[PDB]
Design an enzyme around this catalytic site. Sequence first.
Site, mmCIF file in Angstrom:
data_model
loop_
_atom_site.group_PDB
_atom_site.id
_atom_site.type_symbol
_atom_site.label_atom_id
_atom_site.label_comp_id
_atom_site.label_asym_id
_atom_site.label_seq_id
_atom_site.Cartn_x
_atom_site.Cartn_y
_atom_site.Cartn_z
ATOM 1 N N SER A 93 35.785 -27.579 -63.922
ATOM 2 C CA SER A 93 37.196 -27.861 -64.157
ATOM 3 C C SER A 93 37.416 -28.266 -65.616
ATOM 4 C CB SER A 93 37.701 -28.860 -63.092
ATOM 5 O OG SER A 93 39.094 -29.069 -63.128
ATOM 6 N N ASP A 215 42.215 -22.583 -53.852
ATOM 7 C CA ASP A 215 42.041 -23.845 -54.565
ATOM 8 C C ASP A 215 43.421 -24.348 -54.890
ATOM 9 O OD1 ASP A 215 41.663 -25.820 -56.523
ATOM 10 O OD2 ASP A 215 40.094 -24.730 -57.607
ATOM 11 N N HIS A 244 38.538 -27.138 -54.557
ATOM 12 C CA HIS A 244 38.449 -27.215 -56.006
ATOM 13 C C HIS A 244 37.059 -27.623 -56.498
ATOM 14 C CE1 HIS A 244 39.740 -27.513 -60.077
ATOM 15 N NE2 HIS A 244 39.500 -28.814 -60.148
#
Length: 268
Positions: A93, A215, A244
Amino acid sequence: SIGLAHNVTILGSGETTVVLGHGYGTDQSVWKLLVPYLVDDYKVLLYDHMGAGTTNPDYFDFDRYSSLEGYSYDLIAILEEFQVSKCIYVGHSMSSMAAAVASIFRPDLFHKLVMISPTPRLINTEEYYGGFEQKVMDETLRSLDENFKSLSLGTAPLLLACDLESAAMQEYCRTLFNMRPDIACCITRMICGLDLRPYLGHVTVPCHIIQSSNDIMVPVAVGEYLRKNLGGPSVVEVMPTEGHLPHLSMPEVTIPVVLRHIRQDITD
């Protein structure tokens, strides 16, 4: 000293170094199932971003960590201190996006970026869909501080795509709630406000974009957006996972994918 401050750990051996960078709400322990598949082939550097619960709150600079750039510059310092160059950076991320920004300034430090569930921007515009509406985000953030635990608990099963009672949930919550609350709220606000789109065309190191098929934080079209807007080569692989943090919740699918992108270059 920067190594201690970020709990840097070094393992393995080899001519190439893999650097593992965790995302929000986790620490370097998130990589525990991936490491055994790297240790024989690579030197591996693990670290905790500043503000993880395993880090000293006295070192958390609320001004620096209110934008992602501070994390990118810290990363460069860590790599330099540990004499790492041309690394394979694996990030989850915003860690992967912090490395992307770092690589504009120091492309010499990065051979490639492996990016798990990246997004350059959460908030929707008329031309860009990130998944989140400004007017809703504004209401939610107004009462974030007093509601941090309840909002986090309430959304985590959807964020993770895991049951409340699951091992994955327990593990995520362990690290998430290890952050000091004021720090967690600063980091949360930072992420919600990010817009890294202006940097993308100037990222040139090769990027390997690994996404979940569902996600809530990353619309599937964001991967293609990144491929089209990055300045160098990239590959996009959507996995048959949900959530996620597929590296945490679905390691049986995700680890083999991550390993393939670590081990196999798309440039010569």
